[PDB]
Design a protein around this ligand. Structure first.
Ligand SMILES: Nc1nc2c(ncn2[C@@H]2O[C@H](COP(=O)(O)OP(=O)(O)O)[C@@H](O)[C@H]2O)c(=O)[nH]1
Ligand SMILES: Nc1nc2c(ncn2[C@@H]2O[C@H](COP(=O)(O)OP(=O)(O)O)[C@@H](O)[C@H]2O)c(=O)[nH]1
Ligand SMILES: [Mn+2]
Ligand SMILES: [Mn+2]
Lengths: 288, 288
């Protein structure tokens, strides 16, 4: 029956693990990748503080993912009891450039359905971790909460083989982490109320400084940069930002949708959005 | 640990009780009224299908309410086990005309904090029931779900003593249930991006047809009217509307905030909003 919580005593701080701050890791999943799963299992944030939430599309592809995901969860949750995740929720979804717009709008609904259903009165942090992020440091959560920001996006790169240099290498991958520019605002001012700007919209091109390219091999991993747009690859959100209402709009919101409109929404709710240009995590390879 | 739910198999229908559709009744509460509580207990929707959520402000007034509320919950949850509410969550809040704007914006955060924290992967319906609604029919939930609408506002009146006629009587109370008018849109088109229109804004006056006055003593209780703005007095929402993202904006949203901006948000998410002009429920008396 009865559950009592003072939300003002629920903190999100730099020292999340020591303070026993609960985190909810949310992953929309069209394809199950074992390395994503193994990378998750290698996170060293205490398991008793972690809840997991997944949402799969209602398609042949989603159902194959669901099967593999269910099997992986069964193995972990029936191993030693001290190492179980506190809770795991699996949901199936309720629901050019023009293709991208439609796809992003559909994703916005999936993310909301998952977020609303799973966030609770004890959650301090929500980590948005896409199912194709296959490599992070094992201290990902501690590393990111340390910054104590309302919203914090890691920079998403991708490994590949460099044919010229005959050696493994890395390249930028996620261009949804960006700062707004005057050029970006002007172009948006001139647009109709339901026109959406998404990545690859010709005239803005890369005129909104993309975080991916601020990666500095000579810099340090704690570097922070102010952002205006984020993706959902590996993006850490204080629970209070979502509880105040910031969500993933399926409709045009200042000409933005989904994860980018989310950032704009958190700013309207008086939160600041940041990114880590020199803290890289990795999206699955083209060759994988 | 493990919880599985297909959200597409989670229905909100006309025959909610028979279909065992779970409802979450959400009440922000600054003042505990025994008649509100007794009226809630007299609802005859099955208890095993009801979860309750409350959120109180962090003030002397809220803490007095909290004490009385806790006592009332203890009595009900430790009576016969067959009649317990499935779950009860109590939260304390994390956080002219100009006064109304500030008050409504603060309420929007409270409603979101409560909604996000308490809605779950099994919820079919969310009833927003203000803590000063002290009389409804005992079949309130069945009566309202019967309509099978995305959003449905009951018409909120208030009892008083008629001094002239020397007899109990009734008067309209909630003017946040309205239809938009051309005059309303024109006046809003001419306003700055962060100007808010709230009840009592001089120029719109009552030019947005108010549902309160469409009450027809000669009409029938099943009458439906299309709305554009709602309050949170006694307003029933299919869970999918919230899961898709519709929430209570604390920032100006098409010049609307809180419950009115919520309705506008659900419309942007392609939902239709309705009201019951001849289905009256009652806000506590001035004399009470
Ligand atoms: N629930 C759900 N997840 C999806 C869907 N499409 C892609 N995903 C997941 O959403 C995330 C982003 O995937 P996608 O946009 O295809 O890859 P990207 O373009 O390389 O970021 C990954 O976690 C995918 O598994 C969908 O239709 N529904
Ligand atoms: N959590 C919370 N609830 C409030 C606060 N102020 C009022 N309420 C509740 O919000 C609802 C609307 O109350 P109010 O706006 O004062 O009454 P109205 O103007 O007659 O609708 C009722 O359920 C009140 O108990 C607040 O600051 N925080
Ligand atoms: Mn991908
Ligand atoms: Mn009142």
């Amino acid at each position: 029956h009865i559950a009592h919580y003072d939300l003002n005593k629920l903190h999100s701080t730099s020292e999340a693990a020591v303070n026993k701050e609960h985190i909810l890791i949310l992953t929309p999943m069209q394809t199950f990748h074992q390395q994503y799963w193994d990378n998750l299992l290698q996170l060293n944030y205490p398991r008793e503080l972690i809840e997991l939430g997944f949402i799969t599309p209602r398609t042949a592809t989603g159902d194959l993912a669901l099967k593999k995901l269910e099997n992986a969860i069964k193995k972990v949750q029936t191993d030693k009891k001290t190492q179980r995740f506190s809770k795991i929720t699996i949901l199936r979804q309720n629901s050019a450039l023009d293709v991208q717009k439609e796809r992003r709008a559909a994703m916005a609904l999936a993310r909301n359905e998952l977020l609303f259903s799973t966030i609770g009165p004890h959650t301090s942090w929500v980590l948005w971790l896409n199912a194709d992020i296959i490599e992070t440091p094992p201290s990902l959560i501690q590393d990111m909460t340390k910054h104590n920001k309302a919203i914090l996006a890691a920079n998403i790169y991708q490994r590949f083989y460099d044919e010229e240099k005959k050696q493994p290498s890395i390249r930028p991958y996620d261009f949804n982490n960006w700062q707004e520019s005057d050029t970006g605002l002007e172009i948006a001012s001139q647009m109709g109320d339901d026109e959406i700007i998404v990545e690859g919209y010709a005239e803005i091109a890369t005129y909104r400084p993309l975080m991916a390219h601020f990666y500095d091999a000579n810099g340090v991993p704690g570097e922070e940069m102010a952002l205006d747009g984020v993706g959902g690859g590996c993006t850490l959100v204080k629970a209070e930002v979502h509880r105040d209402g910031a969500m993933f709009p399926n409709f045009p919101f200042y000409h933005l949708i989904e994860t980018e409109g989310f950032a704009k929404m958190a700013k309207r709710l008086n939160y600041d959005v940041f990114g880590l240009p020199n803290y890289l995590v990795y999206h699955i390879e083209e060759e994988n």
